[PDB]
Amino acid sequence: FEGGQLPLFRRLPKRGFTNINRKEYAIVNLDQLNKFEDGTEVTPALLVESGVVKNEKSGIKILGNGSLDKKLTVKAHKFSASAAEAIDAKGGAHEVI
Amino acid sequence: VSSTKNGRDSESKRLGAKRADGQFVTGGSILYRQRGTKIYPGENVGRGGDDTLFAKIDGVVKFERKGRDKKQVSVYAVA
Amino acid sequence: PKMKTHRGAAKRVKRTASGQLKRSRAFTSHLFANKSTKQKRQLRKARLVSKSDMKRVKQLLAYKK
RNA sequence: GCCGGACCGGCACCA
RNA sequence: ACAUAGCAUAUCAGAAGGCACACCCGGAGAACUGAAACAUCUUAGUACCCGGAGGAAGAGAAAGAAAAUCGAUUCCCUUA
RNA sequence: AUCCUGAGUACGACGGAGCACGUGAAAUUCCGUCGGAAUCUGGGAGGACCAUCUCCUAAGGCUAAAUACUCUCUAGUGACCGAUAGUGAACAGUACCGUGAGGGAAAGGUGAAAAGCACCCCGGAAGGGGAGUGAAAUAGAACCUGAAACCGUGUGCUUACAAGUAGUCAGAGCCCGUUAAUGGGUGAUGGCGUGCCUUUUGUAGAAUGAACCGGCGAGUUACGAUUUGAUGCAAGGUUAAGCAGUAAAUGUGGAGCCGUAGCGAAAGCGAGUCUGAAUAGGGCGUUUAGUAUUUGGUCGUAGACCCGAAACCAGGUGAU
RNA sequence: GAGGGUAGCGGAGAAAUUCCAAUCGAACCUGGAGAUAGCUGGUUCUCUCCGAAAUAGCUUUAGGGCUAGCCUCAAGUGAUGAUUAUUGGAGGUAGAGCACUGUUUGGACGAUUCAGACAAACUCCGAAUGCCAAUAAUUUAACUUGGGAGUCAGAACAUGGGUGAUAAGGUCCGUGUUCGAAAGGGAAACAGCCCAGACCACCAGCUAAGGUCCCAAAAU
RNA sequence: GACAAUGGUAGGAGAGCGUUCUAAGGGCGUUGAAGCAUGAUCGUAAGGACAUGUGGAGCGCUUAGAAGUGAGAAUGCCGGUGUGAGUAGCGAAAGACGGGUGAGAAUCCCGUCCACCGAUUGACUAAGGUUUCCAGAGGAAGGCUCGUCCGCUCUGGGUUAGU
RNA sequence: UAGGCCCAAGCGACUGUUUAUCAAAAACACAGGUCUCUGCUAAACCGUAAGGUGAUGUAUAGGGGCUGACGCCUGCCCGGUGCUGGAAGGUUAAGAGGAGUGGUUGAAGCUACGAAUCGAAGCCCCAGUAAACGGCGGUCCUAAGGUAGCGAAAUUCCUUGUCGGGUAAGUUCCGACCCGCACGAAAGGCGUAACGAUUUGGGCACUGUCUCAACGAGAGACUCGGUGAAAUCAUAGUACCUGUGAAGAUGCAGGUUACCCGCGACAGGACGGAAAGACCCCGUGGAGCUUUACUGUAGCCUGAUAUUGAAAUUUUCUAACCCGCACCACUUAUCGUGGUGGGAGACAGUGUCAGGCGGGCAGUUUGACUGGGGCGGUCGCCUCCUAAAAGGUAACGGAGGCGCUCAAAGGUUCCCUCAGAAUGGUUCAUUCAUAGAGUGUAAAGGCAUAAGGGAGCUUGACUGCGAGACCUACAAGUCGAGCAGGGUCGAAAGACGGACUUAGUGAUCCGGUGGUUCCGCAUG
Ligand SMILES: [K+]
Ligand SMILES: [K+]
Ligand SMILES: [K+]
Ligand SMILES: [K+]
Ligand SMILES: [K+]
Ligand SMILES: [K+]
Ligand SMILES: [K+]
Ligand SMILES: [K+]
Ligand SMILES: [K+]
Ligand SMILES: [K+]
Ligand SMILES: [Mg+2]
Ligand SMILES: [Mg+2]
Ligand SMILES: [Mg+2]
Ligand SMILES: [Mg+2]
Ligand SMILES: [Mg+2]
Ligand SMILES: [Mg+2]
Ligand SMILES: [Mg+2]
Ligand SMILES: [Mg+2]
Ligand SMILES: [Mg+2]
Ligand SMILES: [Mg+2]
Ligand SMILES: [Mg+2]
Ligand SMILES: [Mg+2]
Ligand SMILES: [Mg+2]
Ligand SMILES: [Mg+2]
Ligand SMILES: [Mg+2]
Ligand SMILES: [Mg+2]
Ligand SMILES: [Mg+2]
Ligand SMILES: [Mg+2]
Ligand SMILES: [Mg+2]
Ligand SMILES: [Mg+2]
Ligand SMILES: [Mg+2]
Ligand SMILES: [Mg+2]
Ligand SMILES: [Mg+2]
Ligand SMILES: [Mg+2]
Ligand SMILES: [Mg+2]
Ligand SMILES: [Mg+2]
Ligand SMILES: [Mg+2]
Ligand SMILES: [Mg+2]
Ligand SMILES: [Mg+2]
Ligand SMILES: [Mg+2]
Ligand SMILES: [Mg+2]
Ligand SMILES: [Mg+2]
Ligand SMILES: [Mg+2]
Ligand SMILES: [Mg+2]
Ligand SMILES: [Mg+2]
Ligand SMILES: [Mg+2]
Ligand SMILES: [Mg+2]
Ligand SMILES: [Mg+2]
Ligand SMILES: [Mg+2]
Ligand SMILES: [Mg+2]
Ligand SMILES: [Mg+2]
Ligand SMILES: [Mg+2]
Ligand SMILES: [Mg+2]
Ligand SMILES: [Mg+2]
Ligand SMILES: [Mg+2]
Ligand SMILES: [Mg+2]
Ligand SMILES: [Mg+2]
Ligand SMILES: [Mg+2]
Ligand SMILES: [Mg+2]
Ligand SMILES: [Mg+2]
Ligand SMILES: [Mg+2]
Ligand SMILES: [Mg+2]
Ligand SMILES: [Mg+2]
Ligand SMILES: [Mg+2]
Ligand SMILES: [Mg+2]
Ligand SMILES: [Mg+2]
Ligand SMILES: [Mg+2]
Ligand SMILES: [Mg+2]
Ligand SMILES: [Mg+2]
Ligand SMILES: [Mg+2]
Ligand SMILES: [Mg+2]
Ligand SMILES: [Mg+2]
Ligand SMILES: [Mg+2]
Ligand SMILES: [Mg+2]
Ligand SMILES: [Mg+2]
Ligand SMILES: [Mg+2]
Ligand SMILES: [Mg+2]
Ligand SMILES: [Mg+2]
Ligand SMILES: [Mg+2]
Ligand SMILES: [Mg+2]
Ligand SMILES: [Mg+2]
Ligand SMILES: [Mg+2]
Ligand SMILES: [Mg+2]
Ligand SMILES: [Mg+2]
Ligand SMILES: [Mg+2]
Ligand SMILES: [Mg+2]
Ligand SMILES: [Mg+2]
Ligand SMILES: [Mg+2]
Ligand SMILES: [Mg+2]
Ligand SMILES: [Mg+2]
Ligand SMILES: [Mg+2]
Ligand SMILES: [Mg+2]
Ligand SMILES: [Mg+2]
Ligand SMILES: [Mg+2]
Ligand SMILES: [Mg+2]
Ligand SMILES: [Mg+2]
Ligand SMILES: [Mg+2]
Ligand SMILES: [Mg+2]
Ligand SMILES: [Mg+2]
Ligand SMILES: [Mg+2]
Ligand SMILES: [Mg+2]
Numbered sequence A: 001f002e003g004g005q006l007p008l009f010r011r012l013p014k015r016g017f018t019n020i021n022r023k024e025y026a027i028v029n030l031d032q033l034n035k036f037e038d039g040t041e042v043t044p045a046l047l048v049e050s051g052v053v054k055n056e057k058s059g060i061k062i063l064g065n066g067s068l069d070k071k072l073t074v075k076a077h078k079f080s081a082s083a084a085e086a087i088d089a090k091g092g093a094h095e096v097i
Numbered sequence B: 001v002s003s004t005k006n007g008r009d010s011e012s013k014r015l016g017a018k019r020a021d022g023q024f025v026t027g028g029s030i031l032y033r034q035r036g037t038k039i040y041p042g043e044n045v046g047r048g049g050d051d052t053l054f055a056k057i058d059g060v061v062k063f064e065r066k067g068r069d070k071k072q073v074s075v076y077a078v079a
Numbered sequence C: 001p002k003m004k005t006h007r008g009a010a011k012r013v014k015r016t017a018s019g020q021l022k023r024s025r026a027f028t029s030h031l032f033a034n035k036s037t038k039q040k041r042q043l044r045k046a047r048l049v050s051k052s053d054m055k056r057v058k059q060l061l062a063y064k065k
Numbered sequence D: 001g002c003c004g005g006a007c008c009g010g011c012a013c014c015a
Numbered sequence E: 001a002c003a004u005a006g007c008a009u010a011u012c013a014g015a016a017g018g019c020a021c022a023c024c025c026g027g028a029g030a031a032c033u034g035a036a037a038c039a040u041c042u043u044a045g046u047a048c049c050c051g052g053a054g055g056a057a058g059a060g061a062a063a064g065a066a067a068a069u070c071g072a073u074u075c076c077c078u079u080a
Numbered sequence F: 001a002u003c004c005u006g007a008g009u010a011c012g013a014c015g016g017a018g019c020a021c022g023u024g025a026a027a028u029u030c031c032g033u034c035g036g037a038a039u040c041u042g043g044g045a046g047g048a049c050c051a052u053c054u055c056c057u058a059a060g061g062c063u064a065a066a067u068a069c070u071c072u073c074u075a076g077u078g079a080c081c082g083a084u085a086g087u088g089a090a091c092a093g094u095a096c097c098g099u100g101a102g103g104g105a106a107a108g109g110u111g112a113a114a115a116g117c118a119c120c121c122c123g124g125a126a127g128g129g130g131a132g133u134g135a136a137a138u139a140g141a142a143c144c145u146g147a148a149a150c151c152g153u154g155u156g157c158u159u160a161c162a163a164g165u166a167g168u169c170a171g172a173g174c175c176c177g178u179u180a181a182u183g184g185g186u187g188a189u190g191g192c193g194u195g196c197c198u199u200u201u202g203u204a205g206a207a208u209g210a211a212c213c214g215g216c217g218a219g220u221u222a223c224g225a226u227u228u229g230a231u232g233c234a235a236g237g238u239u240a241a242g243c244a245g246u247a248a249a250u251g252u253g254g255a256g257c258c259g260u261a262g263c264g265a266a267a268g269c270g271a272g273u274c275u276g277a278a279u280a281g282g283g284c285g286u287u288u289a290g291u292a293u294u295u296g297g298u299c300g301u302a303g304a305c306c307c308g309a310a311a312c313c314a315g316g317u318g319a320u
Numbered sequence G: 001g002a003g004g005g006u007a008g009c010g011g012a013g014a015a016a017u018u019c020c021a022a023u024c025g026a027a028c029c030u031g032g033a034g035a036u037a038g039c040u041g042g043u044u045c046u047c048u049c050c051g052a053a054a055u056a057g058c059u060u061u062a063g064g065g066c067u068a069g070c071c072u073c074a075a076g077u078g079a080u081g082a083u084u085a086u087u088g089g090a091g092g093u094a095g096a097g098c099a100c101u102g103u104u105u106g107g108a109c110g111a112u113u114c115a116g117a118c119a120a121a122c123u124c125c126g127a128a129u130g131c132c133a134a135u136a137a138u139u140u141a142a143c144u145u146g147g148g149a150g151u152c153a154g155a156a157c158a159u160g161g162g163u164g165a166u167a168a169g170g171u172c173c174g175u176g177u178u179c180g181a182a183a184g185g186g187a188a189a190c191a192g193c194c195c196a197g198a199c200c201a202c203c204a205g206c207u208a209a210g211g212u213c214c215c216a217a218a219a220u
Numbered sequence H: 001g002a003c004a005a006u007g008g009u010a011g012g013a014g015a016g017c018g019u020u021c022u023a024a025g026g027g028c029g030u031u032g033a034a035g036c037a038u039g040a041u042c043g044u045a046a047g048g049a050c051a052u053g054u055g056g057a058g059c060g061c062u063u064a065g066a067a068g069u070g071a072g073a074a075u076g077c078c079g080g081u082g083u084g085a086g087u088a089g090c091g092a093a094a095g096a097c098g099g100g101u102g103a104g105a106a107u108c109c110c111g112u113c114c115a116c117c118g119a120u121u122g123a124c125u126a127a128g129g130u131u132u133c134c135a136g137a138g139g140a141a142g143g144c145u146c147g148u149c150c151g152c153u154c155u156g157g158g159u160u161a162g163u
Numbered sequence I: 001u002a003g004g005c006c007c008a009a010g011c012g013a014c015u016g017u018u019u020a021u022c023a024a025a026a027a028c029a030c031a032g033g034u035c036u037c038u039g040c041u042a043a044a045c046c047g048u049a050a051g052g053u054g055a056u057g058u059a060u061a062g063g064g065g066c067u068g069a070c071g072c073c074u075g076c077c078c079g080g081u082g083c084u085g086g087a088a089g090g091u092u093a094a095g096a097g098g099a100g101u102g103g104u105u106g107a108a109g110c111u112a113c114g115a116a117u118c119g120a121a122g123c124c125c126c127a128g129u130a131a132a133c134g135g136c137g138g139u140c141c142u143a144a145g146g147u148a149g150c151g152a153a154a155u156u157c158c159u160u161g162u163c164g165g166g167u168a169a170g171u172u173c174c175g176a177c178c179c180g181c182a183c184g185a186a187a188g189g190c191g192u193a194a195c196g197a198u199u200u201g202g203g204c205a206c207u208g209u210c211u212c213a214a215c216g217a218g219a220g221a222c223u224c225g226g227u228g229a230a231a232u233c234a235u236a237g238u239a240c241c242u243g244u245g246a247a248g249a250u251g252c253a254g255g256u257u258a259c260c261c262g263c264g265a266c267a268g269g270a271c272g273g274a275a276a277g278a279c280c281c282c283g284u285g286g287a288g289c290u291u292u293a294c295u296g297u298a299g300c301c302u303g304a305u306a307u308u309g310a311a312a313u314u315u316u317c318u319a320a321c322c323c324g325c326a327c328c329a330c331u332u333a334u335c336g337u338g339g340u341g342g343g344a345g346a347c348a349g350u351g352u353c354a355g356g357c358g359g360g361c362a363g364u365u366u367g368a369c370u371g372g373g374g375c376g377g378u379c380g381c382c383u384c385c386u387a388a389a390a391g392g393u394a395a396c397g398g399a400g401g402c403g404c405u406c407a408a409a410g411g412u413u414c415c416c417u418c419a420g421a422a423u424g425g426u427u428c429a430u431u432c433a434u435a436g437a438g439u440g441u442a443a444a445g446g447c448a449u450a451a452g453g454g455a456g457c458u459u460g461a462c463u464g465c466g467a468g469a470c471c472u473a474c475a476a477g478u479c480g481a482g483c484a485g486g487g488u489c490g491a492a493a494g495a496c497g498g499a500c501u502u503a504g505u506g507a508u509c510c511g512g513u514g515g516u517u518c519c520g521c522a523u524g
Helices: A044-050 A081-089 C007-012 C037-043 C051-061
Strands: A026-029 A060-063 A073-076 A093-096 B030-033 B045-047 B053-055 B059-066 B070-076 C013-015 C021-023
Touching (some): A060 A073, B030 B070, B045 B070, C007 C013
Parallel strands (some): A026 A060, A073 A093
Antiparallel strands (some): B030 B053, B045 B053, C013 C021
16 A cells, blocks of 8 residues: 555556466586486486476476486487487486387 | 635756766766756767767866867766 | 465566666656657666665565566 | 437436 | 035044253245445345254265266265 | 166256356356256266266155253363452342333452350430440451541641742751661752653653552463474474374374475476587586474464554434 | 244345344354564663764655665775865856847948847856865874674754745755754753753853843943 | 764564463572562663561462463453632521539420410321330430430330220 | 503404423414316326315305505516427337347357347426516617606615704704615515504603712621531642733742631632633544435336237227216124125226336535635646755745647658848848857756758667666655667668657546457366
């Protein structure tokens, strides 16, 4: 309340809408992928078990922050272009599942 | 009883000098607010649509004489 | 009981990474002939809730993250 | 604004 | 007209009224108040009143939830 | 699938209502009025609606348990009260007030044991003084303790020429003698000096409030938010209900919640993203620290620091 | 007189807002109920450090509120704060002047010229100051982010002004001080004037304003 | 050790005093607890001791914990007691004396005289009240004084219907 | 113990009634008058209804409005409002009706809408109506401009009008005048015998009302015995004067006066006691009341539809529905229920939906500033002065303007220079003329680089932005170099993101329109 002056949240306009079908992913970066040893197959179940991912959300997306330094077979729902390129260029492989 | 027909004034426009002679200013700094050319744009100084004088480069402000009855403001690079 | 969010405010702002509130701009509904082209172009751009207003209205959006 | 006569006359009017 | 309504009898004992009627179900239902005025809105289906019951009541066995499937109702956490 | 499977029903229009949802793009449920289907090749729902798909099968009924409450009863509990508290009521819905509905008090304590004062004296009595009982009677019933206001009796100092918020600083004289301290009481006389609270620009104020004394009498708690301090763990931190346990600590419980990534209205992209034709510029971001519990501060929802209206509504009581 | 009837969103009224159980512009009792009260009053132990405001903007706002200003507490940053000296600059007040606009008095000449005056909204001119900056001396702040406020009735005095009447202990702005929230000395007494800012104690000393015949300290 | 600071309302910050309860530890108490009263005691403050008297059974201290935790003001609430003050008043009016009773008499009883009402201050019904009626006894309180008296207190009585 | 009387005036005819507890009256009532409604299940009123009052009445009756005995009388206006009556011309709702359009699947189907046309009352229109609401001015205008009577009045402001009477002296009184601020005919006009605890003026009688007080009786007061309150109260050893001070002092200053303690008296002060001022203002406080304030609503009117049928073309019929209609039975019954007749009849009544009327009733609103409030004025924006030579700076201080305009009055390139005066000519020419002109518009600041004037081309009056600044509580407002995309003018450098600058504007919510690599609730 501003003593009768029009409040800020009445003088400003409403904006946008909420998407009812919005998808949000649990994100894993390459520096988090460093935790596993070479040759390991990474799955959402493995990620939740080892504790990297706490809540699965709409799926698991691999992102390209940090440096991987390991050779892994990463099975996830989504990969960023940089994450896929780094996984493939470190000797490993990735698959969208 | 009676009444007055006056009692009006517009908001004051805060005109006049905004930076001092010998002061360093970044480019775009407003140097002078005015109606008309009370002071002219000199070297490296522009004149806006509402007669505002502003610096076109970074440098030092110099208010200087321009003829007998006019003056100008310039901005010179420090180097 | 739980504090209630201010629903109109929640419809008008969004929360940035550092905790600021992104807001839209007033004078963007109509009467566009009475406003210059530069005025409307720059009114198109969002701003933040000011610090003084934030001091006033922070608790209304405490749950909005 | 909707309609009937030559504006007039009724009806309608929740930024 | 017949019958019916009505009027007597005989037998039974079904109802009546009460409550801690607190909790429950149903009928009916405010205003001060808040909105810094006020009429939509709010107070609130709240107070009060009326009816009906039980140790509980109400609900309950999908013309359901859903979008990989579950499998009556109710209540607690969370979703928020 | 030959037959049956709930009809004035479902449903629709109008007017309403219930649904978190105010008629809205308003599905779903119900009421009044009026209209009004189909029959497994059927019917309904999946938030207007159509199609497809998916799920279901209304218009009949019954159904324990997990849930809600406490005038009661039994057994117990309390960093709850302790007689102005705690029930209004420790001895009462009484006394008292009111035509009535209705309102509604005050008031506990001898002593271990009544051993509750034989007897004598003054007095009509009441009440006393002795004597007795008792550890104690100034524990004698108006009874434990017995504060203050207030009322008296005695007197150490002082006071009848003096003008005053009553004290304070200085100070003789007189009287006493201590928690033994460069002591106590009183005070001739001199200097200075217009109470307190509230509210005010400013109050000695002739502005407010208080007769005095005593008791009672005002920022609290719950649930959320935020911030700070503390502590544990740390790219992690932490459980809720429940179950077990002594109404405990605690164990178990990972559902959920906050972080580890942001940007955009959104689709999305992602250490970037949005805008933009842009490989430009610009906004917000990246370029490690959070989380749980808790002391303090503040805010929100609650009556929310306490007392106070004139009034409004509902149901009753009154034409003595 | 007795027995009865009409009841509060109502009765009754030869009418007065009149009566309905000692106050009727809408009875009384209980409940909603701790209605609401931007108003008034009240709000309980101590000491220590710091210490305001009575302003702006907006407000069905004006004795309320919000944000800013001013206070406080804690973290940070670090020269960015203050004063003076020098130097540079912006600007049109005081004064002055009549070159413009306007006002005005005497001459002369055939409107011009000569002389002399007036101005907040006149200026050919134009200070003192104050302000903005730059790099030496002195000094001690300044800023950022968070927690917590209170304040939005101001008053006198001096001075620059408006208003009023070169009235007001008037009123409205600028500037400074004091009161507010400040005791002490002086001005008889006397918030606001002069001197001066009380940590506590002393039967020591020097001074300020103001004073030195007596009241009453100090010069008959 | 040598320098500096310390007036203050609203208000911010800090440190403490005291009250009740709890936990643990350690103590006091009929050879006298709490409370109350007095004193010339101690600490920078809130406040803490000691001694004596009263009292007659509970109560300190240390650390920590928790609060119905501190009153001088609210025309605050309840209770007690002042002041005004021996003041206003003692509620329409005619009494006097003798005798009696008695601890006590203007005030009770008896007597005489006097006075007042008398379309009523007389007499009888009703409503309403509900034992106030009667006798004996009593005098704390009630009675606007007093009281030996009473509509007051104690004890015992009292209301009779075919009309 | 037991009327004072007389003369004159206002008001009201009269007896009566009223604010229990400050008003008894001129107020109310009244008999009388008039208007209006009402044909009986009357109208009106109470009640949701049933049931009632009206009335066991029936237009010589009942309800409502106004006037208020009686006498003489009661003039003009129907334009407006109300009421009454016409008319179905226009306007409108539900409902009837479906031209047509879209969504979905080439359709049909389902679905969301949906246009002609029909569809009542009311309103718009016409008329009448004043003992209806009202109105009876200022050649002009009106609907019409005051008849009788009365008039300085319960009405007259000026005003103690003027004249006369009454008095020695009369703002009152009586009688006249009319210049009626602002009488006037049933919110009746003018009179009126009788009546009045009515108002007003005069006179007689009479008096302690008074000159002018004195004495006496009794009850209080006062003294004594008994009994014994109250409001009030910060503590009080509580003087006066002049001053001081929150501007009126017991309490402060300087003087002046005053031995300690009672009792009877008095009221100047203690801004004495009493009741949180009734006046006044303020609160986005309350309540009662009003209305052409807003929004509603009881109720009333009207239409559709259901109950609800049968034949002609509104009429008919009877059989549903109705009868506070008769007879009969239940039944010693003015209720009710059945039966039979009669009346009425698919109307009415009632339900649902719709339109209209609706201070009868209800909930609320009805601003602020203000040298108190009201009334007046003002409320946002621009310019100047006040404003104290940066910026800022108030008053119901002093002056004005704005709520636009322009298709060029914008952009660019090129060219050009004004007002005035004198001198000659039946606007033309010369010389002086730094602007003394012009600049769309108010003012100020600017401008002869012209920002002023003209000409050619033109649309930068672009798209995406934007380092950095000004202003500022916020929301807003202002300037802006440069970068990219495409242009215009210019030979070129270059200029151009409207106008010499500064007013010409209004948030959010909601809704309309166009676009859209966005979402769109199982999928499309
Ligand atoms: K119920
Ligand atoms: K309010
Ligand atoms: K509907
Ligand atoms: K603030
Ligand atoms: K001049
Ligand atoms: K009786
Ligand atoms: K009649
Ligand atoms: K008419
Ligand atoms: K003023
Ligand atoms: K100025
Ligand atoms: Mg321009
Ligand atoms: Mg422009
Ligand atoms: Mg029961
Ligand atoms: Mg409100
Ligand atoms: Mg359906
Ligand atoms: Mg079925
Ligand atoms: Mg006690
Ligand atoms: Mg009690
Ligand atoms: Mg004793
Ligand atoms: Mg005792
Ligand atoms: Mg003496
Ligand atoms: Mg003497
Ligand atoms: Mg003195
Ligand atoms: Mg004052
Ligand atoms: Mg006094
Ligand atoms: Mg007061
Ligand atoms: Mg008082
Ligand atoms: Mg007290
Ligand atoms: Mg609070
Ligand atoms: Mg708290
Ligand atoms: Mg706050
Ligand atoms: Mg009255
Ligand atoms: Mg009246
Ligand atoms: Mg009456
Ligand atoms: Mg009464
Ligand atoms: Mg309530
Ligand atoms: Mg209250
Ligand atoms: Mg200080
Ligand atoms: Mg001058
Ligand atoms: Mg003044
Ligand atoms: Mg002055
Ligand atoms: Mg000043
Ligand atoms: Mg103050
Ligand atoms: Mg002082
Ligand atoms: Mg100071
Ligand atoms: Mg003086
Ligand atoms: Mg002095
Ligand atoms: Mg002072
Ligand atoms: Mg000396
Ligand atoms: Mg001397
Ligand atoms: Mg000091
Ligand atoms: Mg201090
Ligand atoms: Mg604090
Ligand atoms: Mg503390
Ligand atoms: Mg303590
Ligand atoms: Mg307390
Ligand atoms: Mg008190
Ligand atoms: Mg007394
Ligand atoms: Mg005496
Ligand atoms: Mg006296
Ligand atoms: Mg006396
Ligand atoms: Mg007496
Ligand atoms: Mg007597
Ligand atoms: Mg008698
Ligand atoms: Mg007797
Ligand atoms: Mg007696
Ligand atoms: Mg007796
Ligand atoms: Mg009369
Ligand atoms: Mg009479
Ligand atoms: Mg009276
Ligand atoms: Mg009277
Ligand atoms: Mg009349
Ligand atoms: Mg007509
Ligand atoms: Mg006529
Ligand atoms: Mg007049
Ligand atoms: Mg008249
Ligand atoms: Mg007439
Ligand atoms: Mg008339
Ligand atoms: Mg008359
Ligand atoms: Mg006489
Ligand atoms: Mg006498
Ligand atoms: Mg006497
Ligand atoms: Mg006496
Ligand atoms: Mg003073
Ligand atoms: Mg004075
Ligand atoms: Mg005096
Ligand atoms: Mg004196
Ligand atoms: Mg005396
Ligand atoms: Mg008084
Ligand atoms: Mg008052
Ligand atoms: Mg009304
Ligand atoms: Mg209301
Ligand atoms: Mg006002
Ligand atoms: Mg005024
Ligand atoms: Mg200045
Ligand atoms: Mg200036
Ligand atoms: Mg104007
Ligand atoms: Mg205008
Ligand atoms: Mg141009
Ligand atoms: Mg769907
Ligand atoms: Mg879909």
